[PDB]
């Protein structure tokens, strides 16, 4: 009974991060020790004529990004563990996240390590233009 959500390629990393005291540090350390990024994310088929903004209600990938379903790019959603903000609510689940094509091999790690500019809504370094 029930419906599988995962594939065997993710068992090791998800088990490791599900038990970790600090899940973000565990995923970064797992990647640094040569572990494969989390796969089976929700990658979107989109026009690539979007605004390029980082977190949006509909897919907004431009020609240099891929759009993904938000919960699928969140380490805390993927491991079914507490989100580290005081209210415990997710900022990615229920939205789409635009990830640079050069980083789309590891959308979970990309969102973990990067920050969105609160003024223009683009990722810092990819490419928030306001200094």
Partner 1 sequence: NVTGLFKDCSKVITGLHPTQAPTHLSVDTKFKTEGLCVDIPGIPKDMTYRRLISMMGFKMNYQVNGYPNMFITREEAIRHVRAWIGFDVEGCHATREAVGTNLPLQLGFSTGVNLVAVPTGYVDTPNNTDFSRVSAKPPPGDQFKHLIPLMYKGLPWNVVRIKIVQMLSDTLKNLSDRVVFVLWAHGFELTSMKYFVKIGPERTCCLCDRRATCFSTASDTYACWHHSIGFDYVYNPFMIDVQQWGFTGNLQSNHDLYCQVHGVASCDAIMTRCLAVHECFVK
Ligand X SMILES: CN(Cc1ccccc1)C(N)=O
Q: Does 69 bind partner 1 (CB under 8 A)?
A: yes
Contact indicator for 64, 100 with CB cutoff of 8 Å: yes
Which residue in 42, 44, 77, 81 binds Zn ion (CB under 5 A)? 77
86 binding partner (options ligand X, partner 1, Zn ion, none; Cβ < 5 to 8 Å by kind): none
116 binding partner (options Zn ion, partner 1, ligand X, none; Cβ < 5 to 8 Å by kind): none
- Is 103 marked as binding a ligand? no
Which residues touch 99 (CB under 8 Å, ≥6 apart)? 65, 66, 67, 68, 73, 107, 110, 111
Q: Does 118 bind ligand X (CB under 6 A)?
A: no
CB nearer ligand X, residue 50 or residue 70: 70
120 binding partner (options partner 1, ligand X, Zn ion, none; Cβ < 5 to 8 Å by kind): Zn ion
Q: What is the number of the residue whose Cβ is closest to ligand X?
A: 3
Q: Does 90 bind Zn ion (CB under 5 A)?
A: yes
Rounded to an integer, what distance in angstroms lies between the CA atom of residue 96 and that of residue 37? 19
Which residues touch 61 (CB under 8 Å, ≥6 apart)? 44, 46, 48, 50, 52, 67, 98
Q: Does 117 bind Zn ion (CB under 5 A)?
A: yes
Number of C-beta neighbours around residue 69 at 10 A? 20
């Amino acid at each position: 009974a029930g419906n599988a959500t995962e594939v065997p390629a993710n068992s090791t990393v998800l088990s490791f991060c599900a038990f970790a005291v600090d899940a973000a540090k565990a995923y970064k350390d797992y990647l640094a020790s040569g572990g494969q990024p989390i796969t089976n994310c929700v990658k979107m088929l989109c026009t690539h004529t979007g605004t390029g903004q980082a977190i949006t209600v509909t897919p907004e990938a431009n020609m240099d990004q891929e759009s993904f379903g938000g919960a699928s790019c969140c380490l805390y959603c993927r491991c079914h563990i507490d989100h580290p903000n005081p209210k415990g609510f997710c900022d990615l689940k229920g939205k789409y996240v635009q990830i640079p094509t050069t980083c789309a091999n590891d959308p979970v790690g990309f969102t973990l390590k990067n920050t969105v500019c609160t003024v223009c809504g683009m990722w810092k370094g990819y490419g928030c233009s306001c200094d």
